[PDB]
Amino acid sequence: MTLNLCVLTPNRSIWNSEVKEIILSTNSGQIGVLPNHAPTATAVDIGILRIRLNDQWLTLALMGGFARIGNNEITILVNDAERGSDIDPQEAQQTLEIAEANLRKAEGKRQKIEANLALRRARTRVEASNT
Amino acid sequence: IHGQVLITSWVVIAILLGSAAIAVRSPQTIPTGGQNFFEYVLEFIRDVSKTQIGEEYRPWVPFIGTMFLFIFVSNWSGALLPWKIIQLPHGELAAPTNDINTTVALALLTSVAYFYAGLTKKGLGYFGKYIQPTPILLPINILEDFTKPLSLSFRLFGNILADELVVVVLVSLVPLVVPIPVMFLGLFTSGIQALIFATLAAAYIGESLE
Amino acid sequence: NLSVVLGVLIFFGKGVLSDLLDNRKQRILN
Amino acid sequence: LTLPIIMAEFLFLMFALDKIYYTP
Amino acid sequence: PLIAAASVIAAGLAVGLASIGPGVGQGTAAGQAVEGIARQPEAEGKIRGTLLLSLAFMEALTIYGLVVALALLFANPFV
Amino acid sequence: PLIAAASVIAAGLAVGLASIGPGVGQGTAAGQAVEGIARQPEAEGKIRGTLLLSLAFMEALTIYGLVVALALLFANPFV
Amino acid sequence: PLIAAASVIAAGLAVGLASIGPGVGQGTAAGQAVEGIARQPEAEGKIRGTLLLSLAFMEALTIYGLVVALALLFANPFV
Amino acid sequence: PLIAAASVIAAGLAVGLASIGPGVGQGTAAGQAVEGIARQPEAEGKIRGTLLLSLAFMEALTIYGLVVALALLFANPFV
Amino acid sequence: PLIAAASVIAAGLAVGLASIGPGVGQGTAAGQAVEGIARQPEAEGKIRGTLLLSLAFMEALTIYGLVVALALLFANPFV
Amino acid sequence: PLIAAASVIAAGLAVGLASIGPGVGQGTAAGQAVEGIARQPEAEGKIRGTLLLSLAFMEALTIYGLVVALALLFANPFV
Amino acid sequence: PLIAAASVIAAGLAVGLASIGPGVGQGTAAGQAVEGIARQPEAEGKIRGTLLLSLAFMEALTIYGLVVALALLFANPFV
Amino acid sequence: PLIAAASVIAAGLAVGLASIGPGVGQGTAAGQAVEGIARQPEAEGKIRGTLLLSLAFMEALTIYGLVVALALLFANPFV
Amino acid sequence: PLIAAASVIAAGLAVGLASIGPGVGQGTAAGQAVEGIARQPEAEGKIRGTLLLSLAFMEALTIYGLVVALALLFANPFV
Amino acid sequence: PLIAAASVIAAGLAVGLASIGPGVGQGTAAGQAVEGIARQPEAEGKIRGTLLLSLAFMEALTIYGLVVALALLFANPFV
Amino acid sequence: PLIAAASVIAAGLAVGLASIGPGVGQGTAAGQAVEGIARQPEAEGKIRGTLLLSLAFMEALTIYGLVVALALLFANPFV
Amino acid sequence: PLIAAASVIAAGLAVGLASIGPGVGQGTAAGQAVEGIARQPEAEGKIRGTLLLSLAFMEALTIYGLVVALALLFANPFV
């Protein structure tokens, strides 16, 4: 029936509250969850976690991971989690600029794939920030 | 002789004989417009030959380049030559490839070519027809030996003769404003099938040489 | 008419083939 | 056998013209 | 009369039965093409070249039926 | 009489069996395109022209049948 | 007599196949379209116009056959 | 005899194939749509109008056959 | 005797094809529906609306054929 | 004599096609149903509601062809 | 005479198609049923319930053709 | 005369079709049952009963056709 | 004469299609079965029993048609 | 006479169809069989028995039509 | 006269179908074999021997149609 | 004569029966190879030469039927 949302990162856990509505992006797309989804495991890409606990759907950023949507539990294992409002939009946008500049510089294969990674994660930080 | 094809094939062979002297006419180490196409087509012969024939590709460079560039110039005489007004009571004036005999000639040429290579370079007594891998594979020998030349020819010949007829079958009803994408697709695929006969010739030589 | 349009477009095609090949010979010269 | 006759004709034709073009 | 009705039904039937393939052919080709275009922003032109190559190659097939239908329609040496 | 009874069935089945095939392929190609469009927001305008031109290539097979049908219906020489 | 008699069967079979083909075409297209909407919720304004233009280019593919059917009903310069 | 008897079989075939094609089309389209509603359980606002317009543009191909059926049953210019 | 003979077979084949198509149509639609609602019953009763609407639109194609079959059966304007 | 000879073929083919289509239809739908029932047992009873409703919708498809066949057999005004 | 001769081929195609359709229907339904069974080793009887509901609803299609076949063969009204 | 011939042809076609359809039905069913036996070993007793019950549901289909042929062959009430 | 030729052609068609169906069915059955036996090499003896059971289930369907055919051939009640 | 022609065409179609069914049958079965043998290297001493018994069960499905061909061509009571 | 003619066309259709069925069958079998090769080259004997035996089973299929065609052509007992 | 009519029927249907196969073939081939050009853009030529050689091999298939049609139409050794 009721679930629990506990995101957890390689150092600690940054959520343990029992929420109603999580909707996170995945490599395949997006999946939405409401209490007692069927047993499921979903690889989650670098996409915002707009968590609609009843009154407040606040934006949370995460930078790649995995999920497990089994009975009465939603564990979110990500490298790092950030609530969207935490990051300032001005410096977020300036870092979006520096990320696009990094991909512009990055003609090499190694540097260019890592810069594409950094680019996407920086852009999602912007999108988390001003929302 | 079969005149309706031979008469126009004569002037196409004249175009060929002139392109034979195009070599010795202008020497350019860096060939500008036009002759760079000649060097690129020589490179194309290098590509297909080194890719499919194998080692003795260069004395077979002539035998592959002749059919390749001849299907090229015969596509030219078939479609791109302006021939609306000219009228012959002997038959249609389309291309050298209007007759079955040119394509069966290219067929027998390629056949005796790989037969020559497989008899000289390998043993005279037996070649790839001899049943070495599994001694009950004589139907494979019979079938492949019997099917390679004629249908090898038919692959090119069908499309080329088909378009050579289709152009006038179209103009007989509607003037040239409609058949022009048909001319486009034909000038597109007629050189591809030239490449195809070339690469299949090359593959048969490689079979004989292996 | 359409014969002329076809000839002009085929002239353009000869030109694009020739100039790509000229670029290749420019590589060889460099 | 008229079509094999024309086949052998064009065979020799390509033989000669092939060689004389495509050596030099 | 008899042979003319035969020629006009053959004119209809040639295109009718020669038409059925190129539709799903172009469909599958362009579908995997556009999925690849979505998979990478770079290769779209190298996609479109080979795609229109195969599309004209395909159109030739139905044009064959169109011209044989035109021949059975007007220019038929039997009617 | 008999000839005009033949040409009408000919043109009807010609347009129908020219419509069936493209009627299969267009849905496939356009569906793969509208699946791939939501993936990357940049390549949308690129994919638009490719899809429209390919669907016009497919509509070519049915406008061919329409030309056949109009020459069988209105500009009929046999009847 | 027989011309109009064959006209009706022609119209029927024609509109039938014209309904058959692009039917399943629109099916697969619309399905993968709404699925593209299902993955990214933002894809709505992106995909709406493209989807409807795909369905329109499918609509014309069968409207050719419908026009031929209705003409072979009414616009009959033979009977 | 031949007119009134031959026509109605054609009308039946018209509406029948008009249900043949759009039936399976609409089926797979609505199925992928409803699986989309099941994947994203709140995209319903974007899903409703899209799915209904797709079902309508599927029903058009059968409404065409219905129109020809009524034009064959009541408003026949031939009988 | 022949008119009422042909209209009978007309109505029979009409309802036959009409019941053919939306059979697999509703089949695949409700199948995707229920598998998605089973793996995720979060929006069950809210999907059920779109489910019944989809089935209504899919029964439209057979109710058209059924009413035209009944008009061929009882209210024959020709015989 | 001839009307009663024509009624039987319409009835038989109608019922045959009517059992062909929605048979595999309901097969697919109820198959995905029971397949998803295992994924979440607790809701299978309320899912069975969608199941019974959609299966009634589908069996209507067959009942339509059936009542057409029964009208062709028993209550025909042309016999 | 001719009527009783012609009725039996219609009833035969009726029973044949009626046996075909629900064949593949029940096949895929029970297949995905035993798939759900191998998924959940415990809920097998609760699966069996909806399974037998589906199987009976699919067999109804064929019992309809069978009652029509019996009413045409043994309890024939017209002969 | 014609009664016997048409009756025996009806029996042959009925049995041929009714042994085609449930064939592929049974095949898909048994295949999914054995693949379910594989991945989940401890279900065997439950698997056997449910599989045989559904298989008998599929057997009733061709039992219908076989006994219909036996009736039209042996106990012909018309000849 | 007519009843004899009708008997033999009915037997031929019946055995033809009755041999068609079970071929495809038991083929996909054995395919998915050996797939399962690769995925669980431990219970091969228990796989064997249910396998041979379903295979006899299938062969009964061929036996039905072959009995009908041999009765049309040798023990004929219509000649 | 036709007593010969009907039986001989019956035999021809019978053997053709008895081939065409078990063709795809044995094909998919042996394909998954060799896939299983390759996937599990220990299992080859076990897979062969099950595969070949299934193969013989499938060969029976065509020897039925073959003995039908023999008993129709040579051992015909009707000649 | 007509008898040898019908025996000829029977042989022709028979060998045609006996080609078709075993063709796709052998192809699927060899395809899944050359797919399963991928896991180890050292199982090549266990693959090739089993596949060759099964394709002998599958060539018996087409040789059935071929010997039936020979029995119709050369050892024609009825003409 | 009638030879003209049947020969013209052949000249119509030959290309139509030819053009279907290489349709689906070219479709799948072009789609896959263009997805490959999308995946590895630098391998464009190493994909393109092979795709083109296969494409011409498919053009030969359809051109066999086109050549038969043209040699039937103009250079007819019968008429």
Added chain:
Amino acid sequence: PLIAAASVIAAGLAVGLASIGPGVGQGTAAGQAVEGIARQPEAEGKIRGTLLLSLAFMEALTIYGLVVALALLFANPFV
């Protein structure tokens, strides 16, 4: 008169129908084989031996039909 006609239509039909099956079988075997090379490209000779032997087998599948057609063309026991 009729004997030559039927013999020659069978002679065409035999080889025409002959190449349907193996024409897909060889293709799918070659495709799975070449996908098998992508992992281990040195065992390409291993895969090639199996594929070549099975291609000889699959070429027999159509060469037997060609044998029937040639024995119908030139080695005729009837005329």
Added chain:
Amino acid sequence: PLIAAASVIAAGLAVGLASIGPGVGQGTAAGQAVEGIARQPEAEGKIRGTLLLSLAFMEALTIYGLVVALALLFANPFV
């Protein structure tokens, strides 16, 4: 007056029906070839030979139809 007609019908139909199998099998084989090529570019020099040899074996099945049709064209024994 009839022998040439049947011969030419057979020649058209054979060269039409020859391209069915290989026309789609070649697309399958070449698509799965160019996919392994795009997957690993290095083995392509090996892959091209295998796929062209498959193309040869498959072009054979259309060579056969063209050869039989051309034999009916020029070296026709029964006219």
